[PDB]
Amino acid sequence: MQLTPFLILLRKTLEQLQEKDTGNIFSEPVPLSEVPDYLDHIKKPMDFFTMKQNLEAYRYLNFDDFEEDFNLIVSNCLKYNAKDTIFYRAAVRLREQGGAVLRQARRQAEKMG
Numbered sequence: 001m002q003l004t005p006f007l008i009l010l011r012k013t014l015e016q017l018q019e020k021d022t023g024n025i026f027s028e029p030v031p032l033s034e035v036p037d038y039l040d041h042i043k044k045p046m047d048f049f050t051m052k053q054n055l056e057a058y059r060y061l062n063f064d065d066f067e068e069d070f071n072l073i074v075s076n077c078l079k080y081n082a083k084d085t086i087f088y089r090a091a092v093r094l095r096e097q098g099g100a101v102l103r104q105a106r107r108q109a110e111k112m113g
C-alpha cells in the first residue's frame, strides 16, 4: 500500500457501487456452470470482484477506465437477459443508482491533479 487519493477514491466508489447491488447479483462473475451459453453472447464479462482485482493491480489509471468497467457490468446484463427478468430489472436499477454514485465520484477525481 502506497496509498494515493485517486486509488482511495476508486476503492470508496467501488464500495458504494456494491452497496447499490443489494442482491449481490453483480458481486462475482456470471457462473458458466449455470449459464453455459453466456460467452457465446458476452465478449467481455465483468463483475465487482474482477473490478476489485483490477483496482489492486493499479490497472485503473483514470476515472473513465473504471467507469467503463462498471458500464460493462450493466450493459452485459441488459444484452444477455430478457427484459422480463430479475437480472435485467436489477441492471436497470444499478444503472440509475450507480450513475448517481459515479457522477459524485467524478467531481472528486476532477479536483485531483
Ligand SMILES: COc1cc2c(cc1NS(=O)(=O)c1ccc(Br)cc1C)n(C)c(=O)n2C
Residues within 6 Å of the ligand: 024, 025, 026, 029, 030, 031, 034, 035, 076, 077, 080, 081, 086, 087
Ligand atoms: C448471481 O448469479 C448470477 C448472476 C447473473 C446471472 C446468473 C447468475 N447465477 S444463476 O445460478 O444463473 C441464477 C439463476 C437464477 C436466479 Br433467480 C438467480 C441466480 C443467481 N446472469 C445470467 C446474469 O446476467 N447475472 C448478473
